[PDB]
Amino acid sequence: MSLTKIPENVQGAVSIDPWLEPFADVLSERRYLADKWLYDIKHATPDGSEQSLVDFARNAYKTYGLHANQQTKEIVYREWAPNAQRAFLVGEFNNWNEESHEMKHKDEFGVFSITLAPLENGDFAIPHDSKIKVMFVLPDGSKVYRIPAWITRATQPSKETAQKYGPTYEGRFWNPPNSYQFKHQRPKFNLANDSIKIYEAHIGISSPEPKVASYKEFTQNVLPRIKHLGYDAIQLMAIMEHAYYASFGYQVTNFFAISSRYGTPEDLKELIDTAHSMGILVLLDVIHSHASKNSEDGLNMFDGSDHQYFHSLTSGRGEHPLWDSRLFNYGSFEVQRFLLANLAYYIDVYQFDGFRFDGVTSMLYLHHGVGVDHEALAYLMLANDLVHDLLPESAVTIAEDVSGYPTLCLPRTAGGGGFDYRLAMALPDMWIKLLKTKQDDDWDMGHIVHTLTNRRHGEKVVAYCESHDQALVGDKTLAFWLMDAAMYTDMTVLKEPTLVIDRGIALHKMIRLITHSLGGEAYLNFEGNEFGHPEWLDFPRVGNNDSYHYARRQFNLVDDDLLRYRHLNEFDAAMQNCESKHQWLNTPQAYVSLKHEVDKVIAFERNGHLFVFNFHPTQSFTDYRIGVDVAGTYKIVLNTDRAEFGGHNRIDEAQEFFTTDLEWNNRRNFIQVYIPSRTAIVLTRQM
Template identity: 35%
Template sequence: MADEGEACDGYLEPPLFHKLLELDSKLKLYRKDFQRRYSKFRGRLEEIEKKEGGLEEFAKGYTHFGINNHPQGGLKCCEWAPGASALYLTGDFNGWSYTSHPYQKLDFGKWELHLPPLSDGSSTIPHLSKLKVVVQVPDGGLLFRLSPWARYVVREPTSVEYDWVHWDPPEPFKVWQNDVRMNLMQYSFTWGSVHVINYEYTDWLLMNFFHSAFTQSFFHSISHARQLSLCLFQEVSGMPALCRPIEEGGQGFDYKLAMAISDKWIQLLKEKKDEDWDMGNIVHTLTNRRHGENCIAYAESHDQALVGDKSLAFWLMDASMYWDMSVTNEVSITVVRGIALHKLIRLITHALGGEAYLNFIGNEFGHPEWLDFPRAGNNESFHYARRQMHLADDHGLRYQHLQNFDISMNHLEERFGWLASPPAYVSCKHEGDKVIAFERAGILFAFNFHPANSYTDYRLGIHLPGKYPYHVTKSNLLFPRFRRKAGIL
């Protein structure tokens, strides 16, 4: 194997690769793979710098592709379709003539069309007129597609297809927000293989974030292009060095999502009785992450709450959430258990699961039911395409207690800073007592998941000797009427 700093088989070694090996010496076995990946990255970056004017300019594809106003007047239309034989623009502006406005083929799969202004200076394509790109495939057939760079698309109430509507208002808005969702998954609307691994396809990846609800959507950004941004990764393979600097041979992400944690909680609630919960398995799931690579922990996300599944609170309390959440009613044992477990699950996930914590919208107060977006199967209903944020503000309902717990939990973290501290030292995983205990940021966390037993004078080993005052059990956090006394686990 090559020495540090040397090239192997023509590949460059990351300049700080030795720091990565200090974290995990076993990665030395894969040194050549890290060198190859780093060299490919450097080569592609240099190509982008040379041909596109830098990564930041390259990522601004929205200013180049689609339809944009030309600096010298008229419109500039640009698409990327490397497999097309010809490309045309059609729409209301030309009476839907399929071939009257052809694009000119450029290098790297690009196609370009310039439309000069009309004699009166107005745009060739009026605001809110409909458009389509006509793609001629190699066998001569024509395909009608929406531009993936379309700024505005609409769907008729009686149709499942979307129309591309040209957006060029006479008076521009002062505030404009673009919610990028699933453009990347709709690449079939263009022509060309999705497996084209070249730098013009990289532009597509840089500009199209896969964002369905919040988790998969926690956004992929470009840290070095904007110094204040965070770069987040979603995956479950455990691939080494995802969240290590590029100079070490990593991929430069700041955090990755700890996706297995939320699945574990739902699995326990769906498949296991309370007395059958495996403490060791819970701890393993919460701590199963690579040292030195930051993770974002969360108790639930849209993956759990979408139709076909239920939110965490709804798995715990189900129909009782419709009848027993009023503070004026006698509380049921189902709600007592549900609220207590909801708080325990969130706190142990927050404290043990990672270096950052995510609340899926409504999780902070135990949002009931599920999410479902308008579709043919529900008669295009918006009824479940909502988050009932008002529930936490209603002082006649118990959701306020769950939200107050969330507020207190985050204030406690701000005070002690366990998310910024090294991983916890777990000292107890007692299967019989259903107790988990660990130390992090100078705090001793002790969780009792036993469905029936409480413990006094419970003996726990600690790493740092001293007196440990209570911070949670004194705070009225378990349940207003049925909370356990301070000092009782």
């Protein structure tokens, strides 16, 4: 007879999706843990009074780590190491003397501290960009050496240093005479109202050369290409320091160090400032789901113990079943401080505009996606509180969550995780299965529409037809599925394309456009796929003889107006700029009027604009009737068949499309369109 219990702190979510009703109590407990931790954090002040969550995070990165005082020329260094009996700062600055610079004060928190006076001549005691370590003496008397956990730069060893010590990274004290000063404002952006179209990029591979390309090169040579394409945002992968390049950035060693293989912190600041000057937001891949198992240059056994940053190996909760990585103890207050400060550091010091949290499925579940892990979810809820407080109404957070955890992207006040978007990570496999298993005459229009529109209510989605995952050596891109190993001989504009190439180009544009318009509330493109980049991506590793041959991006292809890669590129630019003028991404789901299984025609309206796709492999249609709700005059604003997009220029884009007041496909009006085989068009109503 008991009333079904719907606690007030998840009423918002339950109203959004009443399917959640039988889970309301477990959802309420999940939020409640996060809300109690939030209270704990906001009262972690000397007198126990309330502080803001932002102030907590900012005070943390301003007081942990090493800080040079530019006025007094002192240096302060503090380091959390509860298991260590003694701590010493060693480095080039003191010829690695293990006695002269003890961090004598160990506080109630287990934090060692030291202040270094200026030198007799007034110089900083630690030279700019010289090497440092902290040495701990453990209770048993043994010694271990570590890169400080909050170091802002860590570099690969020289050939000689690695001959004597191995590949272990070296910590650097970064204190340049002239820090980069930001000159440009963040672009105007309202998360609730504005569309975000995301260019996913990796600095190291961003040149045609088989090398690690630099921050400066990206700023000079790639940013203009992204501006030309009209993307709203760049998602920078592999920025947090990682010693193993082929990890793609996912094995993080130094959480507060931007990767040094691409250049200096000031080079990356300039990169982000320049993106901002061009109106482009910059997002960071944040890997807070696990850490590299490296000791000394990583956090594993940092203080000599197996229960500081990570759940212990004997707890059964301490290592990943596949990644060979350690798992954070999110219930430790100092680990919460470390991770939350890390987010504020990247927003504040580098002016990133938001984050993509990688590994969210591994965080959410006690078995990591092969029961929910309440502590990891509560940390993500705090993380969203903080990021949205740092940049109110502008900040973006995005979850990489393959599981589709309900409420992940509902607001925290509703009882949800607080993410703005999740990745639509099932969508690439739909396109691969069609291309690999079904003949073209056998494409099911309804199954395409169902998969693209199957989105949880209220949980906004970044759609894409392929991502950095699929570009990798494990799989083939859409370009490879559609055109195999096509070469410059197949891609010349000076001869008629084969059937294969003609079909590949048309579908490459059509698949992107229907994903972009029907599949989500935001869009993502992985670097190179906007122009159908050939071959595949691969990083140097043992399995390929440390080759960089595939660790690059042939951007030169786009500049050759006698090849067809540029046709794909120009269409991508047209798609993004069309959406910028005629919003359809961050809008309610489409109203689909047609998914015709014999004609292979899909038609829908979204945000008042009309979208028509003829997927039929051979049949062209003339005077094809399309239902339209709002009567008026329509004009084509995007046309896949245009010559400069690599089409055959059959469609007259000057034509005025007048509606006729006669019911059709459950709409009050119709227009009539010419749609050749494998073409698509977008129309908007003229005012």
